[PDB]
Amino acid sequence: FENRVAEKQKLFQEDNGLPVHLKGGATDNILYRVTMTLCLGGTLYSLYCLGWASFPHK
Amino acid sequence: MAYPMQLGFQDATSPIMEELLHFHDHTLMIVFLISSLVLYIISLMLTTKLTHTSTMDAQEVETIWTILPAIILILIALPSLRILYMMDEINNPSLTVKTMGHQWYWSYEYTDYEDLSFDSYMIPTSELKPGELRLLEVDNRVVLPMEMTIRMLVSSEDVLHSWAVPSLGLKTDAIPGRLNQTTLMSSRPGLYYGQCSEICGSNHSFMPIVLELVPLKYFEKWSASML
Amino acid sequence: ASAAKGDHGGTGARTWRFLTFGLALPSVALCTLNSWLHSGHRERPAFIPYHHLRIRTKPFSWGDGNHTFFHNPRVNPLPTGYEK
Amino acid sequence: ITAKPAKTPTSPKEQAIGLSVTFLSFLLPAGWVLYHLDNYKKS
Amino acid sequence: ASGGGVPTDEEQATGLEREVMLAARKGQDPYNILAPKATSGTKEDPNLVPSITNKRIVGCICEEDNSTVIWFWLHKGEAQRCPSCGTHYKLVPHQLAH
Amino acid sequence: MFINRWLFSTNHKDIGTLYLLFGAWAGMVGTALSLLIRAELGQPGTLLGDDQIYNVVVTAHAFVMIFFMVMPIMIGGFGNWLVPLMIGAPDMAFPRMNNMSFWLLPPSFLLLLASSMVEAGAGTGWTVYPPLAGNLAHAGASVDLTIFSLHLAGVSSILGAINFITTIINMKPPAMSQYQTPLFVWSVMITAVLLLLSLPVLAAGITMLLTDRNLNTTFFDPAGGGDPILYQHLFWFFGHPEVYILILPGFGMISHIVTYYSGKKEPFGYMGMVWAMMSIGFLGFIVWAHHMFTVGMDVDTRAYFTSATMIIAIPTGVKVFSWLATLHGGNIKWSPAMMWALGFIFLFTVGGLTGIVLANSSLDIVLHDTYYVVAHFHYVLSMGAVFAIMGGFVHWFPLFSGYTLNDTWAKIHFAIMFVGVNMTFFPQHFLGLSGMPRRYSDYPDAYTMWNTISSMGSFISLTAVMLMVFIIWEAFASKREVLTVDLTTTNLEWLNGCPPPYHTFEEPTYVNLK
Amino acid sequence: STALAKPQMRGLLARRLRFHIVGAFMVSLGFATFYKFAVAEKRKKAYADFYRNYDSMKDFEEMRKAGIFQSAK
Amino acid sequence: HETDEEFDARWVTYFNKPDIDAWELRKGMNTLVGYDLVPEPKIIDAALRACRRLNDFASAVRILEVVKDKAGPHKEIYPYVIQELRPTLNELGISTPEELGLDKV
Amino acid sequence: KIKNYQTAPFDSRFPNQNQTRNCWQNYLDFHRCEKAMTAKGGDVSVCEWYRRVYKSLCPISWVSTWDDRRAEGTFPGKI
Amino acid sequence: HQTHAYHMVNPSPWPLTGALSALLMTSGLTMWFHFNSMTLLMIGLTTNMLTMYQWWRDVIRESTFQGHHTPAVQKGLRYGMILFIISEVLFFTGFFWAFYHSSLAPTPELGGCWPPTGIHPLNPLEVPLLNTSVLLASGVSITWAHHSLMEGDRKHMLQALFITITLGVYFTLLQASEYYEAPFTISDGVYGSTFFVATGFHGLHVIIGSTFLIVCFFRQLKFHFTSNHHFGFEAAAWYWHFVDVVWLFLYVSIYWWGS
Amino acid sequence: SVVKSEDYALPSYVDRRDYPLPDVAHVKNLSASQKALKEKEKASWSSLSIDEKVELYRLKFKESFAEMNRSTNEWKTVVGAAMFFIGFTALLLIWEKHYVYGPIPHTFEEEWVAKQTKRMLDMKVAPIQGFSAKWDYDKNEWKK
Amino acid sequence: HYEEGPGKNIPFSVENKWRLLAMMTLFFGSGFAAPFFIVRHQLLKK
Amino acid sequence: APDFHDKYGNAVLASGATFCVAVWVYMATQIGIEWNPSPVGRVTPKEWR
Ligand SMILES: CCCCCCCCCCCCCCCCCC(=O)OCC(COC(=O)CCCCCCCCCCCCCCCCC)OC(=O)CCCCCCCCCCCCCCCCC
Ligand code: HEA
Ligand code: HEA
Numbered sequence A: 001f002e003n004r005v006a007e008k009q010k011l012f013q014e015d016n017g018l019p020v021h022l023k024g025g026a027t028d029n030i031l032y033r034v035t036m037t038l039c040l041g042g043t044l045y046s047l048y049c050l051g052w053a054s055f056p057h058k
Numbered sequence B: 001m002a003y004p005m006q007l008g009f010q011d012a013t014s015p016i017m018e019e020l021l022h023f024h025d026h027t028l029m030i031v032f033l034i035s036s037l038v039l040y041i042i043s044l045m046l047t048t049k050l051t052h053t054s055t056m057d058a059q060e061v062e063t064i065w066t067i068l069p070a071i072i073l074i075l076i077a078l079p080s081l082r083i084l085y086m087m088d089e090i091n092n093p094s095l096t097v098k099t100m101g102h103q104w105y106w107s108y109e110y111t112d113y114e115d116l117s118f119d120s121y122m123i124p125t126s127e128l129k130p131g132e133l134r135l136l137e138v139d140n141r142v143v144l145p146m147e148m149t150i151r152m153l154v155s156s157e158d159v160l161h162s163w164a165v166p167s168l169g170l171k172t173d174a175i176p177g178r179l180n181q182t183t184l185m186s187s188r189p190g191l192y193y194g195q196c197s198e199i200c201g202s203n204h205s206f207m208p209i210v211l212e213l214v215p216l217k218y219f220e221k222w223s224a225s226m227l
Numbered sequence C: 001a002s003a004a005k006g007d008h009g010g011t012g013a014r015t016w017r018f019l020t021f022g023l024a025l026p027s028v029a030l031c032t033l034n035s036w037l038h039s040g041h042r043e044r045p046a047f048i049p050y051h052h053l054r055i056r057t058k059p060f061s062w063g064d065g066n067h068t069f070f071h072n073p074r075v076n077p078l079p080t081g082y083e084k
Numbered sequence D: 001i002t003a004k005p006a007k008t009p010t011s012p013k014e015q016a017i018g019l020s021v022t023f024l025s026f027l028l029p030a031g032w033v034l035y036h037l038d039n040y041k042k043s
Numbered sequence E: 001a002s003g004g005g006v007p008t009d010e011e012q013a014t015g016l017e018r019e020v021m022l023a024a025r026k027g028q029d030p031y032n033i034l035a036p037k038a039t040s041g042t043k044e045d046p047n048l049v050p051s052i053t054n055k056r057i058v059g060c061i062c063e064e065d066n067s068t069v070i071w072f073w074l075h076k077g078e079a080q081r082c083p084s085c086g087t088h089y090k091l092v093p094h095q096l097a098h
Numbered sequence F: 001m002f003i004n005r006w007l008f009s010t011n012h013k014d015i016g017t018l019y020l021l022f023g024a025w026a027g028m029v030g031t032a033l034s035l036l037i038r039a040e041l042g043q044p045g046t047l048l049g050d051d052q053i054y055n056v057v058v059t060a061h062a063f064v065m066i067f068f069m070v071m072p073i074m075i076g077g078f079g080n081w082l083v084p085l086m087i088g089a090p091d092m093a094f095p096r097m098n099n100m101s102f103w104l105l106p107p108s109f110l111l112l113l114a115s116s117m118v119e120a121g122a123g124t125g126w127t128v129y130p131p132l133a134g135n136l137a138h139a140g141a142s143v144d145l146t147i148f149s150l151h152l153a154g155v156s157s158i159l160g161a162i163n164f165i166t167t168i169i170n171m172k173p174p175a176m177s178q179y180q181t182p183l184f185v186w187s188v189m190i191t192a193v194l195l196l197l198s199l200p201v202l203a204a205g206i207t208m209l210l211t212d213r214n215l216n217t218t219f220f221d222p223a224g225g226g227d228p229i230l231y232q233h234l235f236w237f238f239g240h241p242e243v244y245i246l247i248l249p250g251f252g253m254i255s256h257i258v259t260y261y262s263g264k265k266e267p268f269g270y271m272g273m274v275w276a277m278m279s280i281g282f283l284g285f286i287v288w289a290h291h292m293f294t295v296g297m298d299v300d301t302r303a304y305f306t307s308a309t310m311i312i313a314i315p316t317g318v319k320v321f322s323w324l325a326t327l328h329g330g331n332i333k334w335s336p337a338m339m340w341a342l343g344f345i346f347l348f349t350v351g352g353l354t355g356i357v358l359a360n361s362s363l364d365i366v367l368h369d370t371y372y373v374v375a376h377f378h379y380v381l382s383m384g385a386v387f388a389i390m391g392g393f394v395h396w397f398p399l400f401s402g403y404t405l406n407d408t409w410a411k412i413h414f415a416i417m418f419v420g421v422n423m424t425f426f427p428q429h430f431l432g433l434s435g436m437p438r439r440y441s442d443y444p445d446a447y448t449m450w451n452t453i454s455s456m457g458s459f460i461s462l463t464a465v466m467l468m469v470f471i472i473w474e475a476f477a478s479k480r481e482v483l484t485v486d487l488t489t490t491n492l493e494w495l496n497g498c499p500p501p502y503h504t505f506e507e508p509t510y511v512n513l514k
Numbered sequence G: 001s002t003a004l005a006k007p008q009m010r011g012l013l014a015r016r017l018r019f020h021i022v023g024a025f026m027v028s029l030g031f032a033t034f035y036k037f038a039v040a041e042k043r044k045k046a047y048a049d050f051y052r053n054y055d056s057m058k059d060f061e062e063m064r065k066a067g068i069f070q071s072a073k
Numbered sequence H: 001h002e003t004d005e006e007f008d009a010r011w012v013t014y015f016n017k018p019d020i021d022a023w024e025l026r027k028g029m030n031t032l033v034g035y036d037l038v039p040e041p042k043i044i045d046a047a048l049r050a051c052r053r054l055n056d057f058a059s060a061v062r063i064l065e066v067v068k069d070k071a072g073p074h075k076e077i078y079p080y081v082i083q084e085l086r087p088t089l090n091e092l093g094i095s096t097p098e099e100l101g102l103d104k105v
Numbered sequence I: 001k002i003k004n005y006q007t008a009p010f011d012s013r014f015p016n017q018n019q020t021r022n023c024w025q026n027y028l029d030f031h032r033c034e035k036a037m038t039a040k041g042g043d044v045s046v047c048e049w050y051r052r053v054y055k056s057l058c059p060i061s062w063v064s065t066w067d068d069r070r071a072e073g074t075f076p077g078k079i
Numbered sequence J: 001h002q003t004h005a006y007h008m009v010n011p012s013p014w015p016l017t018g019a020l021s022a023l024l025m026t027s028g029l030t031m032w033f034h035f036n037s038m039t040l041l042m043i044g045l046t047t048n049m050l051t052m053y054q055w056w057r058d059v060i061r062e063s064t065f066q067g068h069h070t071p072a073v074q075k076g077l078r079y080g081m082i083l084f085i086i087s088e089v090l091f092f093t094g095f096f097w098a099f100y101h102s103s104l105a106p107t108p109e110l111g112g113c114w115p116p117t118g119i120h121p122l123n124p125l126e127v128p129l130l131n132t133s134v135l136l137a138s139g140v141s142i143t144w145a146h147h148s149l150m151e152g153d154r155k156h157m158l159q160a161l162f163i164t165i166t167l168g169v170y171f172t173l174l175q176a177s178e179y180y181e182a183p184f185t186i187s188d189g190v191y192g193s194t195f196f197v198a199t200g201f202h203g204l205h206v207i208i209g210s211t212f213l214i215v216c217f218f219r220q221l222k223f224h225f226t227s228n229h230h231f232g233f234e235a236a237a238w239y240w241h242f243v244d245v246v247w248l249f250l251y252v253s254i255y256w257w258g259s
Numbered sequence K: 001s002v003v004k005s006e007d008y009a010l011p012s013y014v015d016r017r018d019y020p021l022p023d024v025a026h027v028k029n030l031s032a033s034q035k036a037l038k039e040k041e042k043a044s045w046s047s048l049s050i051d052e053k054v055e056l057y058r059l060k061f062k063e064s065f066a067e068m069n070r071s072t073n074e075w076k077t078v079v080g081a082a083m084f085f086i087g088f089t090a091l092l093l094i095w096e097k098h099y100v101y102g103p104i105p106h107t108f109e110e111e112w113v114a115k116q117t118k119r120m121l122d123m124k125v126a127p128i129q130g131f132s133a134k135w136d137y138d139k140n141e142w143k144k
Numbered sequence L: 001h002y003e004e005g006p007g008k009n010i011p012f013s014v015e016n017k018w019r020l021l022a023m024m025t026l027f028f029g030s031g032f033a034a035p036f037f038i039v040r041h042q043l044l045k046k
Numbered sequence M: 001a002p003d004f005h006d007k008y009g010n011a012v013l014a015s016g017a018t019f020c021v022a023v024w025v026y027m028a029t030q031i032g033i034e035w036n037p038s039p040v041g042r043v044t045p046k047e048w049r
């Protein structure tokens, strides 16, 4: 391995106004969407499960 | 039992409950005095137009208001700990009785000589007899000899309960797997009531304790007739 | 103690490597010998259905409800005894 | 503290409406439930 | 026994961390990491309070060991005095972006 | 813009505001739960059902008031807003982890609502003792939902505490020592040290309860050799420090409010105030078995817990007298905030003194698990903690919002709440001396009179709560913008205006060493 | 027409304080004395008087005749 | 600390500084009213003459009000102090708050 | 032979509120004594004291569960 | 522009996804324990890993790539890590308390003795002694790693850190094998309960520490650490010595004294 | 005169009796005659009329001590409103008693209580002070 | 960057006092009503 | 200029006091609340056995 820290420092310091979590480029946005979709979808699912569990299934 | 509009403790039925009453009176006197002093000082600080807003020296006064309370605590702790060690002294009981908590009723076992045991359930309100107390009466009372030292042993066969009789100064938790001991001595005959004192589920409110204190000779005949 | 060795002039990488290879790994290799030696199966004890063991107040959330998570048929009996 | 006069004053009439709507928002749902307690118990 | 391959702060530190390390070598403190030392505080010898704008909050610990700090905005212009001990402060505005 | 600001926040003020909104919503749930308790008790006979439903309501009441109302408001809400402003810091040490402490609470609250919706609820008491809380006497999901709710609230406050301690040790001006920070900052750091040490013990104990319920462990089950009493030690080893956690940030706000409305530049006896809060925090870790005096503990153990518990009166009495000494000579301003603080001094003292009565294990045998304990703790919590919160809310609302309350309405609200809480709780002393137990849906007929009066009190407090909502509405509806505030030279949090800009102390304060 | 005399002008707050704190202490001893007579002594004397001639067998006989017991008719 | 006479002399000296500036005048009065006393006439006298050198009539009047306020319910103090200040009031043409109507609510 | 039993006397090895070990110890002692007597061909009646004490102290369900477990071979104490 | 040395963090979604993932895991364990389904739990485990991965990636971005970690930032992280470790020590304390409470007064159900009747403990001189020498060795090799790093020696840093991780992994495998081989299980009364819960939380912390060391390994491969600035590696070393010390207490208490 | 929010960081005016000389004058800007009055103030104050003296005071300060310390009738509104809302609370309790609470247990009926009270006395409930102590067992009546 | 100043540092609008009243009512009212509905749900179950 | 309290104070105080006293009196005495006062000096004991 050679030291490529300087290229990363230039990438993450680019003055493009992006928050750090998206500053890596297109892959950051994809991973974010996957994460937030699983969190929101999975939270809706937990509410459905709570609704199901709230009634006797006799 | 408690009577309507009661303010303080049920009248004491055992010499220990009597000590607790006198010790509470001594403590409450100290409580009323401190909180009157605080309310009074408050009103004193707030009722003048004279001011003094510059930096105030703290060391002199912190002595008084640290040593005064320490001394007062000591004047509480001394009689408190004397009574603690009293309720713990050796006494030689004439009788041992066990009570097991259950959901939701007490059972009692008197197995010094014979195998005597029975369950004790609240009288439902719709079956009270005229003059009987809602939530307090049981079908089978805990009959015990008056004027004698009795060892009570308390445990549970399911969840926690707690076996209490305010008149005698008693409350011992009922814990499955454990055998807790307390001593009971009534100075008088009569009927003494208590209620389960650890949350134990749907009928926690509805599993009372009623002791029936009578002369030894009546106790022996009752024991015999319950076998 | 001081343990029983010596160095201390300066505590550097060289000293700590000296201790990794000269003391720590050899102790591991010794304990490894010692263990891979006292290994191989010890006989399973007679089954006795003691009520304080093999507790089941609720079926486990996997398998048939009755098998612990790292059930070893050879040495873990079920509450009715060792398996076929 | 000093402060400016209200930018959007709330007259006595407006405070009476805000206060009434506030108390109703607490009283009516709980009142509805408690009033119907007997239909719930025996159901 | 030993060789290299590990970058130093001199080679690789960047952004604000590098600025603070480069200022520290010059004996300078643009990011306010050190407590400034008081002058005598008189009107001829006021504490000099650097700022990047035209006012800054000062806290004055009037005597050593006071637990109470006295806080006030110090404005560009004539020296102002601590409202509790009277010690003088003067704002010296501007610069920072080297 | 909206999502970035309010869901992705890394700003101490906005996160402080989220906690205040959350704790205000919890407060409504808590109050409703307390009114159901008192509607059942306001007449003899059975209103709601047997003890299960009644104690589900009692359990939820306590968990909501403690974990979702008082802690988020005092530590999350006031601590986040004020602590960085009071030390001239630009934010918290960990501004993004700060946001996770907040967001862990709505799901913690959801798990608690869930536990009451499923099966028959968790009717266990907020102490969640086994075996009642075990998988036989509370089969099904309610108690596990309750444990997981506490695990989330635990994690939230542990990460909170690490954030506050670090921020307060590390982010002061380089000239400011710890003995130049205001008392409220002290109170939050000390509270945070208690959270840090006590919550992990609770987490261990409720994890053992979770495994007793679902993995066939038997930590608290005598059939496997365990001991129900063990859970009580683990729980109260946390639960006693928890009660000091609920009141300490309250003591810090009281010191600032009394100082401010007395027109003083500083509290009387600062170092005695600091010493007292550290001593209380320390002593708070060695007294827990005063919650266990009837479980059958040896006599010398009961003698030690009685004496060590009493000693807390000493540092606590220092504080009370120092508050009085701060009033002394003041140019007293009778703001609604000052009235809440003066009520706090008196009513907290009363509840502390009935705590000293319970500390005597001999008399506690008779008072334990009766309404005398309920009277003690509602004086320190629903008068103490609550009056501190209301005093701090009316005092700092103009800083957080840039708008004033109508002070006459806020004084009317105080007078209602004062009458309602005292009418609720004062007669419970009589019910406790005369033997009424805790956690009862019904009582023998002799206890009717005090229960009826106590229920009427609670309805008076409901009216004050409803009025508070309307008072907040009125302030935001009329928009009276703050112009000047006095004593800024000794109250640094006001010095950036009202409300302060989003970014404050971007240029730090100047403080020289001399 | 006559000059007004010089009044005390210093320590007015400390002087009011000292006067009322001494007041509060005297009141406190007055209350401690009252309370030991109306509550504490009254209690000890109620118990002492009740028991000095108490006959427990006779107490039981009245209870038993009034029909209150399960074990004694 | 110090005797009463040394406290007063220090305050007299403070206000008697010929080139006392407006800031020192205010600081000296705002500090002085934090103490548990009503200032001696000779202190108030030195503060009124300092008002005169600063050409500030209104603050001379305000200083008389604050003497009256520091006395709280001790109503004999203010009339005694005004009595002792009369030759200074007369010499400097300071009217009291009462002669100005500024004691009306 | 030295009788008139009223109840178990105070026993200084178990002076505290928890008396669980007092019950257990006398239950063990009784059954150890009865086994030693029924071994060496002898009189079980010298064991009688322990039986009286544990009967006075021990909840009937504990005795009964311990008796079933001794009959099943699952009693975990050493007899 | 700021003129203090502290880090104002960009607004971030990871606190919210981390909180939701905590809801999904806990409602998921509930689902699993009572409604026979693993679905929520697996989604919660997944979003939790994703959150941790991005959150810590972003801390790396802010420090190594963006330079936000001035000495005052770094000093705050030191305090945070020390406090965190203190909270984990108290968590273990409550399990040690459970263990001593049950073993010091063994109740009649157990036979009134410790170990309980029918429990046959591991011999503490066999694999438990091997484990102890493993984790003590890995405290020596990680200290060699730290000194190499400070001395600027890339190759011996990677070699010592690799040796440290291999020993963590060996510990983990030895322990998995010992779990399988043990004749007593979690359901064997308070013996199995205290044994498996205390050693199992310990083993989880060994996995967590090994993961953190592996992260430091790859960051060092990528040259992220300077000979003077390397807080991630220090935090992982502190945590690692914590895990070793907890093991010494378990070994002495549960395996040796409790056998 | 007009105070502005964007003035927060500047020294400001306040009427407080413990801070009698505030950091700025109440009125900073002066009209033509107010400027002539400030010049006149530099000469002997005996030459100033009462009106001029008052007007100098009102330039420097907003309210006098008597004004800023005055009492108000606010207490009437506060005590009266609190009683009004406390009275409104009783409306809630009347509704609850009418619509929510059902009949109380039969043990509170007058004949039950009379019998229960007898039985409490026959069992000598609280015979030392609390209850039966207040009954006279010789005259068969409550002690007067 | 964000709006600063009174009425702008909060997640809810105070532009219109009546819309604000409705929002505050839904917000506090939902919290207050919930335990009564949960008690109701529990009674209606068994 | 008289403020709100000068103009309305006396009325708020008189009406509030009167309303509060009347509605609490009505609530306490006319709607069937069981206060359960002490029987001491009030109840004539009656044969129960
Ligand atoms: C709301 C219902 C009230 C019911 C009244 C009782 C009826 C008497 C019947 C008719 C009387 C007939 C005679 C029978 C005597 C039986 C003696 C007994 O058995 O003995 C035991 C009793 C004796 O107690 C009492 O003797 C009543 C206590 C009254 C204390 C004064 C405060 C009263 C304030 C005003 C009303 C309360 C609401 C606000 C209270 C504020 C919180 C303190 O039981 C208690 O322990 C309760 C005390 C609780 C401990 C907290 C104490 C701290 C209080 C604060 C100090 C305030 C200082 C200044 C004084 C405070 C000035 C404001
Ligand atoms: C902080 C704690 C707290 C508070 C404030 C309260 C408030 C009240 N509680 Fe209590 N309560 C407990 C904690 C608390 N409680 C605990 C721990 C238990 C024991 C649980 C158990 O046994 O397991 C308990 C038990 C308990 C019982 C005993 C039940 C039993 O044993 O059967 C009763 C009975 O009357 C009771 C009543 C009330 C009442 C009427 C109030 C009322 O005074 C409430 C009135 C409303 C308020 C005080 C809210 C005001 C403020 C807000 C919502 C803040 C607004 C915020 C902003 C504006 C930012 N509670
Ligand atoms: C804010 C919360 C809070 C606070 C601060 C405290 C403070 C104190 N508490 Fe309490 N307490 C609770 C909340 C709190 N408590 C709760 C929720 C419960 C029940 C838990 C449950 O079971 O659900 C409870 C239960 C509880 C019990 C157990 C009773 C039982 O269940 O049987 C005890 C016993 O010792 C106790 C004691 C004390 C004492 C000595 C203090 C001391 O810190 C108080 C010290 C203060 C003072 C003493 C007043 C000021 C001092 C002076 C003016 C000086 C002069 C005074 C003297 C010389 C005495 N409390």
Ligand SMILES: CCCCC/C=C/C/C=C\C/C=C\C/C=C\CCCC(=O)O[C@H](COC(=O)CCCCCCCCCCCCCCCCC)COP(=O)(O)OCCN
Pocket (backbone or CB within 6 Å): C068, C069, C070, C071, C072, C076, F151, F154, F155, F203, F207, F210, F211, F215, J029, J172, J175, J176, J179, J180, J181, J182, J183, J184, J185, J186, J187, J196, J197, J199, J200, J201, J203, J204
């Ligand atoms: C190899 C060493 C590494 C340990 C990790 C092991 C893998 C399994 C899962 C992860 C467990 C980690 C957490 C600790 C939890 C408790 C039990 C785990 C210790 C363990 O693995 O014990 C096993 C039982 O596991 C069981 O039940 C397993 C039960 C599996 C379900 C996991 C329990 C989930 C609930 C945990 C809730 C966590 C609460 C944490 C709150 C944190 C505080 C805020 C032992 O197997 P056995 O067959 O009984 O005996 C061996 C017989 N031959």
Ligand SMILES: CCCCCCCCCCO[C@@H]1O[C@H](CO)[C@@H](O[C@H]2O[C@H](CO)[C@@H](O)[C@H](O)[C@H]2O)[C@H](O)[C@H]1O
Pocket (backbone or CB within 6 Å): D027, D028, D029, D030, D031, D032, D035, F035, F036, F039, K092, K095, K096, K099
């Ligand atoms: C603990 C906090 C609560 C304290 C007490 C709250 C006071 C309640 C306020 C009024 O609540 C309303 O009361 C009505 C009756 O007064 C109910 O109408 C009910 O009764 C009516 C008339 O008798 C019918 O007209 C309606 O259809 C019927 O639903 C109505 O639903 C309910 O919202």
